[PDB]
RNA sequence: AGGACCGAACCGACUAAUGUUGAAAAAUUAGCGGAUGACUUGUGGCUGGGGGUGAAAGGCCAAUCAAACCGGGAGAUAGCU
RNA sequence: ACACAGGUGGUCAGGUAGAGAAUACCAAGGCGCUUGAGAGAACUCGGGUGAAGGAACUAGGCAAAAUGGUGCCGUAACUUC
RNA sequence: AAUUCCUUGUCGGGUAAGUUCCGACCUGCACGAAUGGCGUAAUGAUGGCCAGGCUGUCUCCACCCGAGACUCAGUGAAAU
RNA sequence: CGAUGUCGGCUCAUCACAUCCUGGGGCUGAAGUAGGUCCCAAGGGUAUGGCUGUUCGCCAUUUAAAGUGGUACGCGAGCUGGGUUUAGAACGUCGUGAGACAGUUCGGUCCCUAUCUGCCGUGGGCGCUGGAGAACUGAGGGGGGCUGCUCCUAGUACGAGAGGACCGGAGUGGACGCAUCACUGGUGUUCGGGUUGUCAUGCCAAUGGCACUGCCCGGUAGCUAAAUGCGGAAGAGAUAAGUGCUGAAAGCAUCUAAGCACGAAACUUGCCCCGAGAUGAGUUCUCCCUGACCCUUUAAGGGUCCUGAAGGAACGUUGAAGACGACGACGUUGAUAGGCCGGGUGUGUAAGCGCAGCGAUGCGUUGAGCUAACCGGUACUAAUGAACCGUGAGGCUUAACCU
């Protein structure tokens, strides 16, 4: 449940660490984002030679959230991290080639079937 | 709004209810017949019978439920000494609310509440 | 009432074992992907269980990779497939929400053995 | 906050109509003790429905 | 085309073989008892009017169980009136089965909704909270402005204000049988119908196709 | 040792809510400042209206102060209402 | 102006926790603050809790929240040391 | 600039984005040396700005505890 | 000028159309994509932040779009008090000076319990031509009306390629609204536990009081949203702009003059709710009432006694009903409420006793004990015999029947 000024966490070697969400896509007025969404992002903090840099300004998907999914039965999958994976502003698709931590069976489709693969654990 | 709840808040706060509840339910068994005001007595029914369905089994374990309901150790024996095997046949009920009109100085609605073999 | 009983009472899984909070347990659910029914586990320590007969339901935590994954699984779903105590434990507490923040060595509890 | 006329009397009396009070439809007589009291409630002496109820 | 008038049991779910868990309403429809035939010839327009439940028989009274006798018919706890559509008939002492939904697709469910008392302004209209801080004085809640000045020097009518909130006839459209279950007299509808446990509902087939 | 620090009483009065025909013709509540000193306070005493007094704001001088209060000239005058 | 949430100098100094006349529960002692009874809508006042986010609110982090004790360790620029 | 009219000066930093801020520039409308100049540690219920922390301030409000409101009895104002 | 008290924000709006988006067209220097302009069209929709008091502006980043205006530059007896606009103070400037500056800067009291209209609700009264109880018709009145994206058609038409459709269909979102509490959660000062200080129950133990519910941890019902169901339509009719057919006036031509077809989120329908106080007071069904008399200025009259129906209301127990009223359920033939029994839930293994242990404590008894609003039962208590109100066949005039 991502709103703007959020901080969030990185889910790749793209080389960030700390980013922000400052803008919701996919309709005006949209509130929340949960996972399997675009959002317009800042970057806080990276390391100090990445492939991104702090103040770059760039797309990124929604992987882990503290509030969870739901599921079909009413099961619910939280997490601790609202964590995210950067794209590109164009192309749309992510940038690092190393997913850290688990993702989702929401996340898979053919927009983002790339990250699934790389993902080392799709719940 | 309140649906399906339960309770009166009688215009007191929820430790005086609790205290006062306390206080009268003693002041009930020491004289086994009160009078008192009709919500204050329709909702003390819901304290003393479950005292006197207490009173139906001399445990020492309901010797300090009931003394913890009360804090007053006369009232703890008159329970269990003579109410219990009073009411000791009795599904519930063991209490009678008779409405005595109302109350001079304000207008209350005052009821006399008593206990059912008292007589 | 007796009508919804009815309906919950033909619908619950009688199979389900009985288990505790702080019970490590593991759990088989289905995933369906293309036509693959698949049956992924899942392991971890239950920490909240909330019980409604039909509706009851159950809180796993596990520490994946790093990261704190809770998943509450619906008992009675029929995606759910197996579940299996691995290791009972001593808890005190009926829901284990101090689980949330003690990690490694403060989130160790012990085994009950009675 | 307030009133720019007067309101007449005519008003008055109108805004009282509502104001009327009510009467005691029932008396019960106590078919023991033969004093009248009010329907479901004790009487004066502590009858209630035919029996003594209370020794006031 | 008529409908069929059921008393609402509860919620619940209804999981599938493929792990969907479908939150059905229990609605219980009891053998709809038809009390008197409509027309156009001495009423003007077609419609059946019926009863269903039981009733104190020594509750009805003198005109109502009247009524009941001309029918020939056991006492309800009320009765209600469907409008027929044409080729569509029925005698007067006729029941009706909760098998007339065994083939519907989607149903629509009248019933008064549950009563929220005297509602504020942002209960009832969905307003907003003014400034809750930065010196707020008494109005943290108070539907602001409510007109103009002097020109429509006046309120509109039909401006949103506080009130009375539910307790009103609604109706929830299309919603999904899920099983038609004739032989204990239940009706499983997707998603939650209005009113409390026990009151009255109204089910209709789908008005919209 | 200290126009030292923290902090009660005491003395204040920064912010905020309340109150605004109040409980109150300036207060309550919750936080705030000083708190061994240019501190604070009690009893008595002096300074009188173009005067007093003033770590000064035209402040204060009996709920009133770019001139107190009370009597008088005085039924001042009023091209105004 | 009131049987008014204000003001009013001095003297007394119990117990436990506690540095303490803080504060908490108490002692001696003194009260229950002179309309009540119900109800448990809006709304207001005074409060309590909060999913996910955490100043995005707003003139302004106003207010709330949060911090808080003792002991020990460690402690920057700067400096009138 | 507590002073700059033009003026949101320009440039730099800061922010995704800065009419504020901080640093340069001097084009000082109209600074400037006891109606003091420029510094200045400490200090401040001081002014502006930033960061962290925290949170119903906010998205977006929900629920609860009381005191009122409300009904009943007694009393019983006010401006206009 | 015996006061119409103000900029901006906030909260609620409402209207216009000179249309920002969506809809429909005409023309294009319109290949397609895109535009461009014009015409019809107000139905709905019509961002969030940074800057500064802003209005305005600029910028970021979205969106289909980030419309223009009116409404005392809408809205302070609704809020705010930043700006301006008092008294303090200061700078620059001006003035010998007091002071002054649409120059700047720091600081700076926003009252009002609603009488009427208005409005939102909700009642009482009476009417509706005998009374009563229900059920409706619908004269009207409100509400509702947004849109993206993907895929198919199809890399098709097109195009030199780049690129890339119409139309039609499917799917899925955003926003909004209605409902709901099964799920997910929140709250849950009445349930349960832990724990601090202290005091008390003779003491130990066990409790309890107070300390913001002492502080916490969970949490039932209910209420709730962030939770999840549903909705916006399709269609009809009649149209706007526009497109036509036939077709003269006017041997031709011509969309029109006769006639005829089409034509849009607009219109009227269709959908939802209110809805016979629709005084024109509607309709249907059921039920109830079949007394004597006197009196006169015979009347739809006055009084007397008899009679008291259907039913109603009061009362009482009450409610997922509710400010009050109302509404609903029930009043012994009775499950209405409370209690009780059983379940369930939650808390998480009570007390007591035994053991172990110097002890704190641990183990056993023990998933124990406790358990609010839930569920299913139960007359145990309280819902009185009643009484009260409402009556006695329903004016007149024609008409049609019927005898
Ligand atoms: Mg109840
Ligand atoms: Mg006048
Ligand atoms: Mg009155
Ligand atoms: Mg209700
Ligand atoms: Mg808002
Ligand atoms: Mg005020
Ligand atoms: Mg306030
Ligand atoms: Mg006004
Ligand atoms: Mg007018
Ligand atoms: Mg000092
Ligand atoms: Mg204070
Ligand atoms: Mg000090
Ligand atoms: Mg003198
Ligand atoms: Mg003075
Ligand atoms: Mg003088
Ligand atoms: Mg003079
Ligand atoms: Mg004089
Ligand atoms: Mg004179
Ligand atoms: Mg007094
Ligand atoms: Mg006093
Ligand atoms: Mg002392
Ligand atoms: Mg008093
Ligand atoms: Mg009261
Ligand atoms: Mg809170
Ligand atoms: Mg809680
Ligand atoms: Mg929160
Ligand atoms: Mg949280
Ligand atoms: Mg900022
Ligand atoms: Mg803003
Ligand atoms: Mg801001
Ligand atoms: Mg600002
Ligand atoms: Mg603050
Ligand atoms: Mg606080
Ligand atoms: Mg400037
Ligand atoms: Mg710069
Ligand atoms: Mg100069
Ligand atoms: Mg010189
Ligand atoms: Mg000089
Ligand atoms: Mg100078
Ligand atoms: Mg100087
Ligand atoms: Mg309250
Ligand atoms: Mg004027
Ligand atoms: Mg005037
Ligand atoms: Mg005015
Ligand atoms: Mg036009
Ligand atoms: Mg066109
Ligand atoms: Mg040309
Ligand atoms: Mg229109
Ligand atoms: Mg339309
Ligand atoms: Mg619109
Ligand atoms: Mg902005
Ligand atoms: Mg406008
Ligand atoms: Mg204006
Ligand atoms: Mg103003
Ligand atoms: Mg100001
Ligand atoms: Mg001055
Ligand atoms: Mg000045
Ligand atoms: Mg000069
Ligand atoms: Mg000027
Ligand atoms: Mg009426
Ligand atoms: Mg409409
Ligand atoms: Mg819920
Ligand atoms: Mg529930
Ligand atoms: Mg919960
Ligand atoms: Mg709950
Ligand atoms: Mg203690
Ligand atoms: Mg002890
Ligand atoms: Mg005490
Ligand atoms: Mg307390
Ligand atoms: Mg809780
Ligand atoms: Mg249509
Ligand atoms: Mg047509
Ligand atoms: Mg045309
Ligand atoms: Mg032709
Ligand atoms: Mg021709
Ligand atoms: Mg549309
Ligand atoms: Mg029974
Ligand atoms: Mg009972
Ligand atoms: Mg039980
Ligand atoms: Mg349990
Ligand atoms: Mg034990
Ligand atoms: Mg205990
Ligand atoms: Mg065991
Ligand atoms: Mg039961």
Same mark, same amino acid.
């Given at each position: 449940?991502?709103?703007?000024?959020?901080?969030?966490?990185?889910?790749?070697?793209?080389?960030?660490?700390?980013?922000?969400?400052?803008?919701?896509?996919?309709?005006?007025?949209?509130?929340?984002?949960?996972?399997?969404?675009?959002?317009?992002?800042?970057?806080?903090?990276?390391?100090?030679?990445?492939?991104?840099?702090?103040?770059?300004?760039?797309?990124?998907?929604?992987?882990?959230?503290?509030?969870?999914?739901?599921?079909?039965?009413?099961?619910?999958?939280?997490?601790?991290?609202?964590?995210?994976?950067?794209?590109?502003?164009?192309?749309?698709?992510?940038?690092?080639?190393?997913?850290?931590?688990?993702?989702?069976?929401?996340?898979?489709?053919?927009?983002?079937?790339?990250?699934?693969?790389?993902?080392?654990?799709?719940? | 709004?309140?649906?399906?709840?339960?309770?009166?808040?009688?215009?007191?706060?929820?430790?005086?209810?609790?205290?006062?509840?306390?206080?009268?339910?003693?002041?009930?068994?020491?004289?086994?017949?009160?009078?008192?005001?009709?919500?204050?007595?329709?909702?003390?029914?819901?304290?003393? =019978?479950?005292?006197?369905? &207490?009173?139906?089994?001399?445990?020492?374990?309901?010797?300090?439920? %009931?003394?913890?309901? *009360? !804090?007053?150790? =006369?009232?703890?024996?008159? &329970?269990?000494?003579?109410?219990?095997?009073?009411?000791?046949?009795? %599904?519930?009920?063991? *209490? !009678?609310?008779?409405?005595?009109?109302?109350?001079?100085?304000?207008?209350?609605?005052?009821?006399?509440?008593?206990?059912?073999?008292?007589? | 009432?007796?009508?919804?009983?009815?309906?919950?009472?033909?619908?619950?899984?009688?199979?389900?074992?009985?288990?505790?909070?702080?019970?490590?347990?593991?759990?088989?659910?289905?995933?369906?992907?293309?036509?693959?029914?698949?049956?992924?586990?899942?392991?971890?320590?239950?920490?909240?269980?909330?019980?409604?007969?039909?509706?009851?339901?159950?809180?796993?935590?596990?520490?994946?990779?790093?990261?704190?994954?809770?998943?509450?699984?619906?008992?009675?779903?029929?995606?759910?497939?197996?579940?299996?105590?691995?290791?009972?434990?001593?808890?005190?507490?009926?829901?284990?929400?101090?689980?949330?923040?003690?990690?490694?060595?403060?989130?160790?509890?012990?085994?009950?053995?009675? | 906050?307030?009133?720019?006329?007067?309101?007449?009397?005519?008003?008055?009396?109108?805004?009282?109509?509502?104001?009327?009070?009510?009467?005691?439809?029932?008396?019960?007589?106590?078919?023991?003790?033969?004093?009248?009291?009010?329907?479901?409630?004790?009487?004066?002496?502590?009858?209630?429905?035919?029996?003594?109820?209370?020794?006031? | 085309?008529?409908?069929?008038?059921?008393?609402?049991?509860?919620?619940?779910?209804?999981?599938?073989?493929?792990?969907?868990?479908?939150?059905?309403?229990?609605?219980?429809?009891?053998?709809?008892?038809?009390?008197?035939?409509?027309?156009?010839?001495?009423?003007?327009?077609?419609?059946?009017?019926?009863?269903?439940?039981?009733?104190?028989?020594?509750?009805?009274?003198?005109?109502?169980?009247?009524?009941?006798?001309?029918?020939?018919?056991?006492?309800?706890?009320?009765?209600?009136?469907?409008?027929?559509?044409?080729?569509?008939?029925?005698?007067?002492?006729?029941?009706?089965?909760?098998?007339?939904?065994?083939?519907?697709?989607?149903?629509?469910?009248?019933?008064?909704?549950?009563?929220?008392?005297?509602?504020?302004?942002?209960?009832?209209?969905?307003?907003?909270?003014?400034?809750?801080?930065?010196?707020?004085?008494?109005?943290?809640?108070?539907?602001?402005?409510?007109?103009?000045?002097?020109?429509?020097?006046?309120?509109?009518?039909?401006?949103?204000?506080?009130?009375?909130?539910?307790?009103?006839?609604?109706?929830?459209?299309?919603?999904?049988?899920?099983?038609?279950?004739?032989?204990?007299?239940?009706?499983?509808?997707?998603?939650?119908?209005?009113?409390?446990?026990?009151?009255?509902?109204?089910?209709?087939?789908?008005?919209?196709?």
């Amino acid at each position: 449940m991502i709103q703007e000024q959020t901080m969030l966490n990185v889910a790749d070697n793209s080389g960030a660490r700390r980013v922000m969400c400052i803008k919701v896509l996919g309709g005006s007025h949209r509130r929340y984002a949960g996972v399997g969404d675009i959002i317009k992002i800042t970057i806080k903090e990276a390391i100090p030679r990445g492939k991104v840099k702090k103040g770059d300004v760039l797309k990124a998907v929604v992987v882990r959230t503290k509030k969870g999914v739901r599921r079909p039965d009413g099961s619910v999958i939280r997490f601790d991290g609202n964590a995210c994976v950067l794209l590109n502003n164009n192309s749309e698709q992510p940038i690092g080639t190393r997913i850290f931590g688990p993702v989702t069976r929401e996340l898979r489709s053919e927009k983002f079937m790339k990250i699934i693969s790389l993902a080392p654990e799709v719940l | 709004m309140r649906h399906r709840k339960s309770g009166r808040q009688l215009n007191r706060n929820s430790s005086h209810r609790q205290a006062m509840f306390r206080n009268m339910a003693g002041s009930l068994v020491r004289h086994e017949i009160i009078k008192t005001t009709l919500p204050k007595a329709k909702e003390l029914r819901r304290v003393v =019978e479950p005292l006197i369905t &207490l009173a139906k089994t001399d445990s020492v374990a309901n010797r300090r439920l %009931a003394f913890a309901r *009360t !804090r007053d150790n =006369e009232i703890v024996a008159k &329970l269990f000494n003579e109410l219990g095997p009073r009411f000791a046949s009795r %599904a519930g009920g063991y *209490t !009678r609310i008779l409405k005595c009109g109302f109350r001079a100085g304000d207008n209350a609605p005052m009821a006399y509440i008593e206990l059912v073999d008292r007589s | 009432s007796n009508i919804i009983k009815q309906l919950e009472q033909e619908q619950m899984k009688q199979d389900v074992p009985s288990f505790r909070p702080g019970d490590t347990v593991e759990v088989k659910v289905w995933v369906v992907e293309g036509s693959k029914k698949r049956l992924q586990a899942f392991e971890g320590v239950v920490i909240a269980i909330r019980n409604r007969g039909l509706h009851s339901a159950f809180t796993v935590r596990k520490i994946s990779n790093g990261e704190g994954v809770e998943r509450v699984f619906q008992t009675h779903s029929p995606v759910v497939d197996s579940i299996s105590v691995k290791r009972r434990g001593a808890v005190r507490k009926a829901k284990l929400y101090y689980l949330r923040e003690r990690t490694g060595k403060a989130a160790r509890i012990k085994e009950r053995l009675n | 906050a307030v009133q720019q006329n007067k309101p007449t009397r005519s008003k008055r009396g109108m805004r009282r109509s509502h104001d009327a009070l009510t009467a005691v439809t029932s008396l019960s007589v106590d078919k023991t003790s033969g004093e009248k009291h009010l329907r479901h409630h004790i009487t004066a002496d502590g009858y209630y429905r035919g029996r003594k109820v209370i020794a006031k | 085309m008529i409908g069929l008038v059921g008393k609402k049991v509860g919620m619940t779910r209804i999981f599938t073989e493929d792990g969907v868990s479908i939150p059905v309403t229990v609605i219980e429809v009891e053998a709809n008892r038809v009390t008197q035939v409509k027309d156009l010839a001495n009423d003007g327009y077609r419609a059946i009017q019926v009863t269903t439940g039981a009733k104190k028989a020594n509750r009805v009274t003198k005109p109502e169980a009247g009524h009941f006798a001309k029918a020939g018919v056991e006492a309800g706890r009320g009765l209600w009136e469907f409008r027929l559509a044409e080729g569509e008939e029925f005698t007067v002492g006729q029941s009706i089965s909760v098998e007339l939904f065994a083939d519907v697709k989607k149903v629509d469910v009248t019933g008064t909704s549950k009563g929220k008392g005297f509602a504020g302004t942002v209960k009832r209209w969905n307003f907003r909270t003014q400034d809750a801080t930065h010196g707020n004085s008494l109005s943290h809640r108070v539907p602001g402005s409510i007109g103009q000045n002097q020109t429509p020097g006046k309120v509109f009518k039909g401006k949103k204000m506080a009130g009375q909130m539910g307790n009103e006839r609604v109706t929830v459209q299309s919603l999904d049988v899920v099983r038609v279950d004739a032989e204990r007299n239940l009706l499983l509808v997707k998603g939650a119908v209005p009113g409390a446990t026990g009151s009255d509902l109204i089910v209709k087939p789908a008005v919209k196709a």
